[PDB]
Amino acid sequence: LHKEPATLIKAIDGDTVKLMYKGQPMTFRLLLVDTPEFNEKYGPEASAFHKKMVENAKKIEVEFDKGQRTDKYGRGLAYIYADGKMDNEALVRQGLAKVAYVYKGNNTHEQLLRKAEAQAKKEKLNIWS
Ligand SMILES: Cc1cn([C@H]2C[C@H](OP(=O)(O)O)[C@@H](COP(=O)(O)O)O2)c(=O)[nH]c1=O
Numbered sequence: 001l002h003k004e005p006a007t008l009i010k011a012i013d014g015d016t017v018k019l020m021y022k023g024q025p026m027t028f029r030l031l032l033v034d035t036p037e038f039n040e041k042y043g044p045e046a047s048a049f050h051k052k053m054v055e056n057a058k059k060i061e062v063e064f065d066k067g068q069r070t071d072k073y074g075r076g077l078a079y080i081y082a083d084g085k086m087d088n089e090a091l092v093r094q095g096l097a098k099v100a101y102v103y104k105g106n107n108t109h110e111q112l113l114r115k116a117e118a119q120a121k122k123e124k125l126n127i128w129s
């Protein structure tokens with residue numbers, strides 16, 4: 001898999017972010033995770049975490065997996081990196097997201113994220129508390 005450039009247009013919530021990718025604005029949905037919606041428990045903390053992470057990055061990168069790159073709502077499906085740290089993994093590791101939506105052939109980083117979830121659960125972080 002390959003990291004591609006992008007620039008933040010706007011933070012949205014725990015598992016979506018608006019980025020300019022190949023010069024076009026797009027909403028990206030983070031692969032392999034699910035954050036609570038803003039109005040549910042840990043929802044505001046997940047949004048806040050993701051926001052900070054994307055707003056502080058000097059470099060944002062998009063990494064598509066091997067399968068579909070856009071979902072049925074037209075959102076980009078990617079692993080997103082902020083200064084080389086994966087947003088998807090960071091949210092899971094903090095117990096602000098669960099591993100979820102694991103479809104065959106867009107699941108390269110499945111085991112990496114499950115490992116982060118196991119550590120977050122061990123530490124009883126946030127969602128696991
Ligand atoms: C993460 C992801 C979500 N989706 C779709 C599945 C869900 O359909 P439904 O809307 O029909 O439930 C929805 C979940 O996204 P959200 O968690 O952003 O709502 O997005 C995919 O199709 N592919 C994926 O890789």
Ligand SMILES: [Ca+2]
Nearest residue numbers: 015034035036
């Ligand atoms: Ca969600």
